[PDB]
Structures are given as structure tokens and as C-alpha cells.
Amino acid sequence: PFVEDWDLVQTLGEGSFGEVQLAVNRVTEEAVAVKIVDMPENIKKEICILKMLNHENVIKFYGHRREGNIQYLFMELASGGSLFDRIEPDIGMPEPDAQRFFHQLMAGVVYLHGIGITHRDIKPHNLLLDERDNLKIADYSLATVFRYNNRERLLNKMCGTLPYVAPELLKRREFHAEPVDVWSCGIVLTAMLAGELPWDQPSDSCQEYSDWKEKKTYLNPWKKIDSAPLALLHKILVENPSARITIPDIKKDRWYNKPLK
Ligand SMILES: CN1CCN(c2ccc(OCc3ccccc3)c(C(=O)Nc3cccnc3)c2)CC1
Numbered sequence: 001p002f003v004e005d006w007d008l009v010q011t012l013g014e015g016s017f018g019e020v021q022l023a024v025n026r027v028t029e030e031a032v033a034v035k036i037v038d039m040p041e042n043i044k045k046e047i048c049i050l051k052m053l054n055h056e057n058v059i060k061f062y063g064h065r066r067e068g069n070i071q072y073l074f075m076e077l078a079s080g081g082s083l084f085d086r087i088e089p090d091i092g093m094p095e096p097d098a099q100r101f102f103h104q105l106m107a108g109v110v111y112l113h114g115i116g117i118t119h120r121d122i123k124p125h126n127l128l129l130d131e132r133d134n135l136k137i138a139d140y141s142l143a144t145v146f147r148y149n150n151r152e153r154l155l156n157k158m159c160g161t162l163p164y165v166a167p168e169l170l171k172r173r174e175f176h177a178e179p180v181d182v183w184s185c186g187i188v189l190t191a192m193l194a195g196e197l198p199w200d201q202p203s204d205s206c207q208e209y210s211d212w213k214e215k216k217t218y219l220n221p222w223k224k225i226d227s228a229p230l231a232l233l234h235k236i237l238v239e240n241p242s243a244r245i246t247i248p249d250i251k252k253d254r255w256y257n258k259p260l261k
Pocket residue numbers: 012013014015019020033059075076077078079080081082125126128138139
């Protein structure tokens with residue numbers, strides 16, 4: 001029935017593990033986002049995490065259907081598109097829009113981490129907008145459990161997107177999940193405020209990453225950023241994950257608490 005219930009109108013994007021399509025129902029014309037996977041059982045894990053999600057700043061999971069070898073995952077379509085499309089290259093966006101999206105990103109991330117889930121691929125492509133421009137964290141294909149029965153487990157898989165990835169994930173055999181998601185959030189904030197990513201990756205072979213470690217914020221992208229948010233970015237984009245600021249402390253930051261417009 002699926003082909004008789006739903007029409008796949010277009011490609012929306014690809015997750016790390018899969019591809020998702022705009023689907024419109026042939027009776028109701030209801031429009032949804034559908035992820036279709038040809039069935040290895042990473043998907044079983046993805047589904048199970050998707051079933052846990054209940055928050056305003058996380059995408060809405062409708063449910064799943066398995067037909068043939070193929071699995072179907074249905075989710076709320078984000079009528080606002082992705083955050084990536086609100087970033088003007090070389091410019092970013094107005095500082096108050098950035099702050100609001102960053103407040104919302106932090107709300108979603110706090111939520112995930114409080115259920116012991118790490119997203120592992122936070123970037124503007126995976127941050128979607130509803131009709132009222134409320135941000136929603138999407139794509140749980142790399143998400144995983146880092147805390148269960150109140151015990152933390154360290155991660156050891158490299159994954160994500162290079163320019164968003166924390167430097168410890170390139171160097172350490174094992175590392176803590178939360179500080180890696182905090183890192184990526186800082187790269188997203190950079191992108192929102194400067195319309196460009198600071199480095200290809202956070203390794204010593206990368207000159208722009210060295211420049212930042214030497215504190216040369218007279219260079220781009222940093223020179224485009226006002227002093228208050230830059231001060232936050234200095235706390236987030238700290239190489240040593242154990243000195244990196246934590247989300248509770250982000251919520252006390254000066255710019256984070258600045259009334260804007
Ligand atoms: C008017 N249109 C409305 C829809 N517009 C739009 C554009 C990209 C999208 O996803 C990109 C994506 C991001 C991550 C992974 C794959 C694809 C979605 C969307 O709703 N996707 C989605 C929803 C729920 C769960 N997952 C993805 C919607 C573009 C503007």
C-alpha cells in the first residue's frame with residue numbers, strides 16, 4: 001500500500017546513514033518527511049531512539065512501517081526548512097536571530113543529554129525550522145546512548161562532519177559525549193554569526209585552527225563577531241574537553257543572557 005498511500009514528491013536530504021523524502025498523502029494531502037531504508041540494523045537503534053523523543057526542539061517522530069526488506073520512518077515535515085538556509089554566506093544572520101536559535105539549540109541539546117542521548121552530528125543542515133521558526137534538532141542516524149542507569153559510557157567511534165567535530169575525537173581513543181556536542185554547537189554559532197566555518201578540521205595540520213589556538217581573533221571569521229558572543233566562543237571552542245564550558249555554564253554566559261534587538 002505505501003506507494004498507494006504516499007507519493008514521494010522530492011528529495012529532502014541524506015542523513016549520515018540514509019536518505020529522506022518529502023511525502024504527501026494521496027487522500028489527505030498531509031505532507032511529511034519520510035526516511036526510507038533498504039534493509040545493518042543500525043536502523044533498529046535509530047528507531048528506538050526516535051521513539052524516546054518528546055521535546056519542542058527535537059523533531060517529531062510519527063512512527064514506522066516495514067514492507068519487503070524496506071523500512072519507512074515518518075516524521076514531521078519542518079515547514080521552515082533548515083537553519084543552513086538562513087545563514088547568508090560570509091554574513092551569517094542578525095545577532096538577535098542567532099541568539100534565539102542558539103537558545104533553542106541549547107534547549108534541545110540539554111533535553112537529549114538529559115535522556116542520555118548524544119546526537120553526534122549537530123550542524124545547520126540537521127537543525128530544522130517549523131512554521132514559527134522554532135528550531136528542531138533532526139537526524140538521529142548517528143545518535144547513541146552515552147548514559148544508562150546513571151552510568152556514563154565513553155564514546156570511541158569517530159563520526160560527524162569534520163568542520164563540526166571536536167578535536168578530541170580526532171586524537172583520543174575514547175572521549176566524553178557531551179563536550180563533543182557542545183563543540184559542534186559552537187561551530188554552529190560561529191556559522192550563524194559569520195556565515196563561514198572557521199576551519200576544515202580542528203587539527204594541527206590546519207592553519208586556521210592554529211591561528212585560533214594562538215588567539216588571532218583579528219582574523220576571519222572571528223573579526224566579524226561582536227565581542228560578547230566571541231567571548232562565549234572562547235569558552236566553547238577550547239581544545240581540552242575537560243576545560244571546555246558545559247551547558248549549565250553556557251546558560252550563565254553574558255551574551256547568552258543579553259537582551260537583544
Ligand atoms: C518548503 N520546504 C519545506 C521543507 N523543507 C525542508 C528542507 C530540508 C529538510 O530536511 C533536511 C534533512 C535534514 C536531516 C536529515 C535529512 C534531511 C526538511 C525536513 O523536514 N526534513 C526532516 C524532517 C524530519 C526529520 N528529518 C528530516 C524540510 C524545505 C522548505
